[PDB]
Structures are given as structure tokens and as C-alpha cells.
Design a protein around this ligand. Structure first.
Ligand code: RG4
Length: 289
């Protein structure tokens, strides 16, 4: 229901894998009263990528939650393709950049507020049997100082009816340093691996996105920065097999790190639920206040 001729390009907001998001104004009355929106498109409209995109659009459309970015509509020109996803525009950018920019005014209670919101959004995904597969502060957006939203769903898959995991191995880079061990070894993605990645998100938050402290930097320094191409993955697997883990971030209390390390359990079935993670984060945040 969005006509392409009324979307006015303003700037690029972000560039994902096979996708990009643009800040546009939807101004059908041509009087500069229309609203600014976010428009997602494919960088190269492959038939396979187009079918993935259609599934992503339906997934997002099916989601309604304070902590999930709002679907608004779709757009297409010159027939059916050039397909574009229209979403609400969130003015503070990604939580990665936002935390980096205000580290001296965002204290731990605020971090835990964001954490809780992320947990509740992920739990909502779970009730729909959706596996996000790409949890990272770079894929959390900031609506305002009090609200974050899960921001991108390009890698989200729906669980089979009969199984609690989805086996997929895609070409491209994969965010290996947020991957559960069973995702690196068997391409198995589950709620439990989303929980692992959430552990990494919590690490990210408490590092305040410091340069040398990113999961890639830390993990490369634990395996050796020389490590060569695909060998990287292999060593990562071995490192995680021997319970090598990201270190406790500077200033991070013991209980928060413990939440992280319980998320980083090699035994998929021993990782906590998102509801319990929310419960615990909320108890800590209420104790701090
Ligand atoms: N998530 C996220 C990260 C990132 C890219 C991930 C893959 C493609 C985009 N990205 C998303 C925005 C954005 N910014 C403001 N409003 C928005 N609405 C909807 C998105 C969006 C900016 N960069």
C-alpha cells in the first residue's frame, strides 16, 4: 500500500547481509507533511533471497510487541519485485552505537532495563516458535532512552512442527562469535542457541562496546590472531569445547556474569529460559533500586 514514487530517500541507516535499510520520508501529498519511515530492500534481488525476504516480511507482520520493531507495510514497483519492507523509524539508531555514544550516562540499572526488554521480546518470539538466529546489540534499535526493540529478522526461521531446532547453514559470513557451539558444529539453531547469543548480548552491554573488548577481539585473542581462515572456526569450536569463555566485563558484578555463563552452557538443555532470565534480571534491577 506504499507507492514507491512517494518514498523520498534521505540516507542509509544500516546494511545487513543481502539487505539494507534506508531512512525515507513517505510523503504522498507532496507537501513535506508525510512521516519518516524505515525501508528495507535487497542489495541484489536473487530469487532465493526474494523468497527469504517474503518469509521475513510475513514473520515481522505476525509480530506485535513493545520490544519488536513495528511492521508498517510493503512496497513494490515495475510489476511485483523491487519488493520493499516498510517499518517504523527508530530515531536513536542501534543499541550498539547508542550505548557506545552515551557510555558515561548509562548505568547498570539502565543496562538491565534494556536486557529485560530484550528478554521479553525474545520470549514473545519463542511463543511463536520463531528462532531469531542473529541476536546482537547491532540488531537492537533504540526508540528512546527507555525503550529498545529487536530490530532485524533477516535470519529468523520458524521451527518445524515436529522438532525443537532448525538445521540451516548458509553461505556468507555467519556471526560465529555469537554462535552456540552446536550451531558451529551442526548448524542447529534453537531457542537454546538464541539464549546463548543473548548471553553474548549481555556481555556486549556490560563492555559498553569498548574497542578491544568485542566478542571478536576477545575470541581472536584467545585463539591467536594469526589463525587462518576456516581454521578460526575450528579453533573457536575447540576453545568453546574446553569451556573457554569471554571474560567478565570491567565493572560487571558477579551475578550478571553468572547469568552470562549460565547462558554459555555447552549442554543446550541446561541453558535457562528467557522467562527465567527476565525474572532474574528484574530481581537484580529491583534490588539495585
Ligand atoms: N536492526 C538492525 C540493524 C541495522 C541493519 C540490520 C540488517 C539491515 C539493517 N539497522 C536497522 C536500522 C533501523 N534504523 C531505524 N529504524 C529502523 N526500523 C527498522 C530498522 C531500522 C538501522 N540499521
Amino acid at each position: 500500500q506504499f507507492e514507491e514514487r512517494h518514498l523520498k530517500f534521505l540516507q542509509q541507516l544500516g546494511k545487513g547481509n543481502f539487505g539494507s535499510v534506508e531512512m525515507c520520508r513517505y510523503d504522498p501529498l507532496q507537501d513535506n507533511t508525510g512521516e519518516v519511515v524505515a525501508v528495507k530492500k535487497l542489495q541484489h534481488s536473487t530469487e532465493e533471497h526474494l523468497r527469504d525476504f517474503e518469509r521475513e516480511i510475513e514473520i515481522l507482520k505476525s509480530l506485535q510487541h513493545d520490544n519488536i520493531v513495528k511492521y508498517k507495510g510493503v512496497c513494490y514497483s515495475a510489476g511485483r519485485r523491487n519488493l520493499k519492507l516498510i517499518m517504523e523509524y527508530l530515531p536513536y539508531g542501534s543499541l550498539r552505537d547508542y550505548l557506545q555514544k552515551h557510555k558515561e550516562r548509562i548505568d547498570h540499572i539502565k543496562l538491565l532495563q534494556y536486557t529485560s526488554q530484550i528478554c521479553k521480546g525474545m520470549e514473545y518470539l519463542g511463543t511463536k516458535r520463531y528462532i531469531h538466529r542473529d541476536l546482537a546489540t547491532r540488531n537492537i534499535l533504540v526508540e528512546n532512552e527507555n525503550r529498545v526493540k529487536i530490530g532485524d529478522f533477516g535470519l529468523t526461521k520458524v521451527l518445524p512442527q515436529d522438532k525443537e531446532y532448525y538445521k540451516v547453514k548458509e553461505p556468507g559470513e555467519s556471526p560465529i562469535f555469537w554462535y552456540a557451539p552446536e550451531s558451529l558444529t551442526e548448524s542447529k539453531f534453537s531457542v537454546a542457541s538464541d539464549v546463548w547469543s543473548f548471553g553474548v548480548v549481555l556481555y556486549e552491554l556490560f563492555t559498553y562496546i569498548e574497542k578491544s573488548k568485542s566478542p571478536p577481539a576477545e575470541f581472536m585473542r584467545m585463539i591467536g590472531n594469526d589463525k587462518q581462515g576456516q581454521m578460526i572456526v575450528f579453533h573457536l569450536i575447540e576453545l568453546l569445547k574446553n569451556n573457554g569463555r569471554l571474560p567478565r566485563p570491567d565493572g560487571c558484578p558477579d551475578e550478571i556474569y553468572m547469568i552470562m555463563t549460565e547462558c554459555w552452557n555447552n549442554n543446550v538443555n541446561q541453558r535457562p529460559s528467557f522467562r527465567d532470565l527476565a525474572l532474574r534480571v528484574d530481581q537484580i534491577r529491583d534490588n539495585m533500586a
